[PDB]
Amino acid sequence: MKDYDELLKYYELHETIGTGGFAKVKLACHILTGEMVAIKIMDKNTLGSDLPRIKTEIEALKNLRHQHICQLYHVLETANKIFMVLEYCPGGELFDYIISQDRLSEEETRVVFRQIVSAVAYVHSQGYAHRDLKPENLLFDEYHKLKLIDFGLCAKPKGNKCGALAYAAPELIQGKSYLGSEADVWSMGILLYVLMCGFLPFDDDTAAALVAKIMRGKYDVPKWLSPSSILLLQQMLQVDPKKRISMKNLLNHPWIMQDYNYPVEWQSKNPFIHLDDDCVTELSVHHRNNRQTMEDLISLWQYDHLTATYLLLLAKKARGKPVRLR
Amino acid sequence: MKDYDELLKYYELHETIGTGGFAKVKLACHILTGEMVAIKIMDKNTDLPRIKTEIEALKNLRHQHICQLYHVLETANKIFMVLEYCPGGELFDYIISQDRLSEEETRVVFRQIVSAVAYVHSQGYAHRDLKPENLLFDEYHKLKLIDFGLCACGALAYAAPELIQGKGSEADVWSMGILLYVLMCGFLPFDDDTAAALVAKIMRGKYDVPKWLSPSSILLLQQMLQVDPKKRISMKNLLNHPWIMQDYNYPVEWQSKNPFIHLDDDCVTELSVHHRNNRQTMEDLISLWQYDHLTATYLLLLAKKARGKPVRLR
Numbered sequence: 001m002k003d004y005d006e007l008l009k010y011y012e013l014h015e016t017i018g019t020g021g022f023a024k025v026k027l028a029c030h031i032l033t034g035e036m037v038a039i040k041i042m043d044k045n046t047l048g049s050d051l052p053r054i055k056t057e058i059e060a061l062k063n064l065r066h067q068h069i070c071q072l073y074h075v076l077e078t079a080n081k082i083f084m085v086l087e088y089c090p091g092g093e094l095f096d097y098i099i100s101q102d103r104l105s106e107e108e109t110r111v112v113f114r115q116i117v118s119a120v121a122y123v124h125s126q127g128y129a130h131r132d133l134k135p136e137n138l139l140f141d142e143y144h145k146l147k148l149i150d151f152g153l154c155a156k157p158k159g160n161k162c163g164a165l166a167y168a169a170p171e172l173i174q175g176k177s178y179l180g181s182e183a184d185v186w187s188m189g190i191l192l193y194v195l196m197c198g199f200l201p202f203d204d205d206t207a208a209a210l211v212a213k214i215m216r217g218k219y220d221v222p223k224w225l226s227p228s229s230i231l232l233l234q235q236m237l238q239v240d241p242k243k244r245i246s247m248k249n250l251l252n253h254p255w256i257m258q259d260y261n262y263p264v265e266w267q268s269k270n271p272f273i274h275l276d277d278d279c280v281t282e283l284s285v286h287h288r289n290n291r292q293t294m295e296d297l298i299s300l301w302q303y304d305h306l307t308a309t310y311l312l313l314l315a316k317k318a319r320g321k322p323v324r325l326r
Numbered sequence: 327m328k329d330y331d332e333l334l335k336y337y338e339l340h341e342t343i344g345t346g347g348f349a350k351v352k353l354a355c356h357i358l359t360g361e362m363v364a365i366k367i368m369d370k371n372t373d374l375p376r377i378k379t380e381i382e383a384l385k386n387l388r389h390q391h392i393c394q395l396y397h398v399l400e401t402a403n404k405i406f407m408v409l410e411y412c413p414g415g416e417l418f419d420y421i422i423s424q425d426r427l428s429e430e431e432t433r434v435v436f437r438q439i440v441s442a443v444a445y446v447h448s449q450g451y452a453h454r455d456l457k458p459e460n461l462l463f464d465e466y467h468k469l470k471l472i473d474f475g476l477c478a479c480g481a482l483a484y485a486a487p488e489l490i491q492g493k494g495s496e497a498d499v500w501s502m503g504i505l506l507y508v509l510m511c512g513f514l515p516f517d518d519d520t521a522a523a524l525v526a527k528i529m530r531g532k533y534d535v536p537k538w539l540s541p542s543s544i545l546l547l548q549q550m551l552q553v554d555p556k557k558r559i560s561m562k563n564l565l566n567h568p569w570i571m572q573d574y575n576y577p578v579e580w581q582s583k584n585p586f587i588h589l590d591d592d593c594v595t596e597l598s599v600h601h602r603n604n605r606q607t608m609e610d611l612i613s614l615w616q617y618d619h620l621t622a623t624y625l626l627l628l629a630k631k632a633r634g635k636p637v638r639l640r
C-alpha cells in the first residue's frame with residue numbers, strides 16, 4: 001500500500017480509533033523509541049476547503065511547544081495523504097467530561113482551568129491567538145493532563161494577516177481591529193462558566209438571537225456560584241476587550257490562587273534552543289554521527305523523523321525510561 | 327448546549343471516534359433499547375448538498391449489508407445522523423493490517439459487497455464511491471456499505487474509464503473489480519503520484535498480475551476490469567459467477583431481508599405498551615418512516631430481536 005510505505009519505515013501501526021470526515025486517527029508505536037503516538041491521517045481528495053486550515057495548524061504547531069499543547073512530532077505527505085504524528089491523548093475531550101456529569105464543583109473546575117490558563121498564556125507569549133477555544137478542543141493525555149488541539153483558526157494579531165459562535169468574543173463577531181489575545185480571554189470566560197454551570201452563559205435556538213445576547217453581555221449568575229467565581233467571571237466576560245482582565249492579572253488572580261497559593265506556571269518545560277545532551281549523545285551513537293553535526297541537524301526542526309525521534313526520546317526520558325534508541 | 331438538548335433525551339453520548347472539519351462521529355447508547363449506535367454530528371456553519379444526498383438515499387435503502395440510518399435530528403447549528411454501530415473498523419484497515427487476504431477470505435467478504443451493490447442497483451441507484459474505506463465491519467464481522475454522498479468522481483483510483491471521460495451500474499462493477507484486486511493483493515492495480523498519470527493508466531487498463539493470484543481470480547478480474555463498459559461482466563452474471571460460487575455452490579443472495587412494508591408484531595406490540603395505544607394506531611405511525619425517535623426505536627428493537635435478546639423497551 002503506496003500511501004503507507006514511508007510511514008511504516010518509522011511507525012508500527014496499532015488500532016484505528018476511527019474516522020470522521022477527511023481524518024482517520026490510528027494509534028502507533030514509534031519504532032526507534034517504543035513510545036505510543038496518535039497518527040492523524042488526512043485524505044487530500046476529501047479535505048477540500050480545510051486544506052489551508054491544515055497548513056495553518058501545522059505552521060503553528062511547529063512553532064509551539066508546551067506541556068499543555070498536544071505535541072506535533074512529525075509531518076509526512078504522499079500524493080493522497082497528509083500524516084500528522086501527534087501526542088497520545090487517550091483520556092478523551094474536556095467536552096465528554098462536561099456532558100458525563102452535572103456541573104463541576106468550583107474545586108474540580110480550578111484543577112482543569114489552571115491548565116487551560118497555562119496553555120493559553122504560553123500561546124499568547126509566542127504572538128499567537130488560538131481563536132477556537134472550546135471544550136472539544138481540549139484533550140486529556142494518559143496522565144489526565146489537558147492538551148490544547150485544533151490550531152486551524154489561529155492567528156498572529158501583530159504579524160502577517162472564528163469557530164463556535166457561543167465561544168466567540170463580541171469584537172470577533174463584529175470583526176474589529178484588536179491585539180487579538182483579548183478574544184481568547186473572553187472564550188476562557190465562557191469555558192469557566194460552562195464548567196461550573198453545565199450550560200452556556202449565552203445560548204439560543206437561532207444564531208441571530210445568540211449574537212444579540214453576546215453583544216448585550218448579560219448572563220445569569222446561578223445561586224451555586226461563589227462570590228469569588230462571580231468576580232472572576234465579570235472580569236473575563238467584559239464586552240469591551242480593553243476592560244477585560246489581562247493575562248498578567250489572570251495568572252495570579254485570587255480565584256486562580258485559591259487552595260494552590262502560587263500563580264499559574266505558564267512557561268514551557270520544552271525548549272527549541274537548550275537541547276538535552278543525553279538525547280543528542282544517544283542520537284549521535286544511533287546515526288554514527290558527531291554531536292555538533294547532530295545538534296545543527298536537530299536545530300533545523302524540520303518535523304521529519306529526526307525531530308520525532310528527538311522529541312519522543314525526550315518524552316521517554318521524562319517518563320523515567322532509559323534514554324535509548326532501539 | 328441547546329444543540330444537544332433533544333439528542334440527549336434519546337441517546338447517552340460515549341467517546342469520539344473521529345473528527346474532521348464540520349464532521350464528528352461519536353459513539354452513543356440508545357436509552358430505550360440499550361443498543362449502541364454511531365452518531366454523525368455535522369456543523370451547518372463549518373458539504374450540505376452531499377449530506378442531503380446521503381440522507382435521501384439512506385431513507386430509501388434498507389439492507390443487511392448497508393449501514394442502517396435510524397434517526398435524523400436537526401438544530402440551528404447541527405445535523406445529527408444516527409447510524410448502525412460498526413466497531414470492526416474499515417475493510418481498508420483490516421486489509422493493510424493483514425497485508426492482503428487469502429482468496430478464501432476475499433470470497434467471504436466479496437459476496438457481501440456484491441449483495442449490497444446488487445441491491446443498490448435494483449433500487450435504481452449507483453453508489454459511485456465504492457472503495458474499502460467505505461465498507462465497515464459490524465460487531466459480528468459482517469460488512470456494511472457507507473457514504474452515499476454521491477448517487478443515482480469519488481477516488482480516481484476506483485473510477486471507471488468511461489466515468490473519468492464523462493460518458494451508472496457498469497461503473498460500480500469496475501470499482502468492485504478494483505476492490506477485488508486490492509483485497510487479494512494489498513495494493514492498487516492502477517496507481518501514480520499525479521492525476522494525469524493515474525488517468526492514463528486507467529484508460530490503458532493494463533495492470534500487473536501477482537504470482538499468488540489463482541487462474542480463477544485472474545479470469546474474474548479480467549471480466550470486471552474491462553475498459554469497455556459493454557464488454558464488462560453484468561451484475562446478473564456476477565451473482566452466480568464460478569469464482570463467486572466456489573466454496574458455496576449457491577448464488578449471491580442480494581434481496582433485502584430488511585422490509586419497509588412488513589412490520590414485526592412482537593416489536594409493534596412492545597412499542598404499543600410504551601406508547602399507550604392499540605395495534606394499527608402504532609402500525610400507521612411506524613409505516614410513516616419519519617426517521618424520528620420512533621423509527622430508531624422500532625429498528626433497534628427489531629435488531630435486538632435478531633440478536634436473540636428479549637423484545638423489551640426500558
Ligand SMILES: O=C(Nc1ccc2c(c1)CCNCC2)c1ccc(Br)cc1
Nearest residue numbers: 017025038070086087088089090149341
Ligand atoms: O490519542 C488520541 N486519541 C485516542 C487515543 C487512545 C485511545 C482513544 C483515543 C480512545 C479511548 N480509549 C483509549 C484509547 C488523539 C490524539 C490527538 C488527537 Br488531535 C486526536 C486523538
Ligand SMILES: O=C(Nc1ccc2c(c1)CCNCC2)c1ccc(Br)cc1
Nearest residue numbers: 016017018364409410411412413415472
Ligand atoms: O461505528 C462506527 N465506527 C467505529 C466504531 C468504533 C470503533 C471504530 C469505528 C474504529 C475501529 N476500532 C474500534 C472503535 C461507524 C458507523 C457508521 C459510520 Br457512517 C461511521 C462509523
